[PDB]
Structures are given as C-alpha cells and as structure tokens.
Amino acid sequence: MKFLFYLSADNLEIARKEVLVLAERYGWVEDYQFEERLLLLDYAGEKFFERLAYTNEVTKIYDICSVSELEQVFSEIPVYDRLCCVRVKGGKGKTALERKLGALLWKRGAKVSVSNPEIVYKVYIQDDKCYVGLLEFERDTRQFFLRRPDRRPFLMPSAIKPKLARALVNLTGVLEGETLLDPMCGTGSFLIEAGLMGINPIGIDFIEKIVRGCRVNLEYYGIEGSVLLGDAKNLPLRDESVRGIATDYPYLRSTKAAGTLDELYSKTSEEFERVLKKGGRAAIVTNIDVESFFSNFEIEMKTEERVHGSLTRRIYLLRRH
C-alpha cells in the first residue's frame, strides 16, 4: 500500500528517519522515496501515525498523475455516502481547483461538504506531479504547544521541546510496554513523551531535587514511570535490560572547558552499549562532535540544529552492533 507522509520543514533528516524507523518496527517496507517535504512509502502492517512528531499529514495514495490527468483520476477514484471534501496543497488557484474537483465527485454521487466532512480527498502538487489520495491522519499541532516545558509544575531552562523529544523516542523504535531509558532526565521531557505513547519510561538524574521535581512532572501528566537517583556513567541496571535510550547531554558553555565531558562520553558510551538490548538504539543530543566516543556503535543518523548562534546541537541515532 502507498502512503504519502507530508513532513515538517524543521529537520527533514529527522522527519524521514522517524517514519522509516517506526515503519520497520510496525510493519514491512517494500520501498520508499523522498521529494522535499514528501515521503512516499510502499508499506504493509500496523499503523503508527498517531506517534509521529515531524509528520504533519499522512495520506493513503490512490494515484500519481500530471495536472492534465487530474480530472480523469477524479472520474475513477472511489466515491462514498459519507460527507467529503477536496483539499489541494501546492501550486496556485488551490480553492478554485478544490471546487472543480469536488464538482467531478458530485457527478458520480458524492456528498461534498466543506464544514463537516468525514472523508478528505488530498491532492499534493509538486513539479507537475499530483499525488491523489485520502487523508489518513493529520497531526494536532496544539497538543505539543499545550505540553510546552514552561507549563510543567517543575521548570528548568533549556528543556528539549515535546516535538523533538517525541521524535527522538520514536527514532529508538521502542514500542508500547518496552523500556525507554533517559539517564540524564532533568525535568522529564523524554520520559513524558515515552509515557504518553505507552512506553515504560525510566529516568536517571544525579541531583536529588531534580529527580523529585521530575517525579512531580510525571504525576502531573499521569504517567507511570520510574525516576532514580544515579549517575549516567555507572548505570544501576542489568545488561541488555532496555530497548531504547533517548537523552540530552550537558552542553559545553565555554571552549575553555574543552575535554571536561570526555569521561562522561566515554563512560556512557560503554554503559549504553552494555545496558541496550541487541540491535538497540540511543538517540542522543550533544553540542560537540562525539563520533570518537561512539565508534563501538553504528551511527545511523547525524544531523545538526543551530539554536542560538552560540549553540549548535548535534543529534545522533546510534545502533548497538
């Protein structure tokens, strides 16, 4: 089956990898292709769309055509008795095209309603290529905003936002009832996103006041998880006990402090590899290049995000091999 994933422009690398990681965990991918903000997946298996953070829309594709073949596909595409509408993304004269296509549907007995449709016909127009299908899923953007880190009862500055935190938990490929570990959990950004998706969250932090505040944040969101006082350098956990690791490392504040995080990177690299299950993943956020510390891992993804102009984030997806 063909699905179009209309991706968020934030980071296309994360957006694409997020879909592909969940698709390989939930089902079976025959093939895929990328074209700017469009990701086409030939897919079978269980739907995972409600979990996606960097995908705005998911459409089940009926046909791919040129602008001139568009009226003919709208003469063939199945019609239903429930209220429908046509939504066009790309090009100019979008509203006029939606009205024109809606009239083609009506000709075959469709009930077109713009106010309360149950079915949405989707047309994506990119470089004289039209992707036609039915809306399967649309992400509620309001949900991440309502979970903004400044809205939690225990607040700390520089928290990872819900959208990036959810994308990173998804990149580990962790499923419902499996364990996701955040060994430098802070206010619990990663723990919250994991818990909301049905994953069992485990948080570790070496400051007592922080583990207490984090536990209050979990209570606040109604999440069942464990928050322990410990050091990420010496994990109080058995070998091969966790499916995924998602974490934000301490950032270097000054170039004068170069090498001070070397021990933390070396110890956690060995500890993450020990504690992860076979083929397990760690999605990590740093502000320095750490390739040399994680040579023991397969680096599946490396992306960058400049945040202040003083801060450039490095985002890695590491796989145990």
Partner: protein, 57 residues
C-alpha cells in the same frame, strides 16, 4: 520505588543482583528501606520512594 523495577535494576558498581530490605511499604511501591548488592555487598538507601544508586565517589 516500584517492586517490578528490581527485575532490571543492578548494582551501579559490579552490576550484580540487588536485594531490598523494606522498612516502609505501600500497595504499589517501596517507600523506605535499603538496597544491598549480592557481590560488592554495597548499600544504597531508599527515602520517600527514591533509591540513591549514585556511586560512593
């Protein structure tokens, strides 16, 4: 501290199995007690349902 947590929890030092010495408990979690290793014999306190499993550095 949830009891089901002992299934994946290990000593932060030697990574051996831990034993819980319950002082105060609840229907769903351990409130007060100690965590003792079966190899190192290293002790770790549990206060207000929080185990302090930080190394003794």
């Amino acid at each position: 501290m949830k009891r089901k947590l002992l299934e994946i929890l290990a000593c932060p030092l030697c990574k051996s199995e831990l034993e819980v010495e319950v002082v105060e408990e609840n229907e769903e979690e351990i409130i007060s007690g100690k965590l003792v290793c079966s190899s190192c014999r290293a002790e770790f306190p549990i206060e207000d349902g929080i185990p302090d499993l930080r190394p003794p550095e």
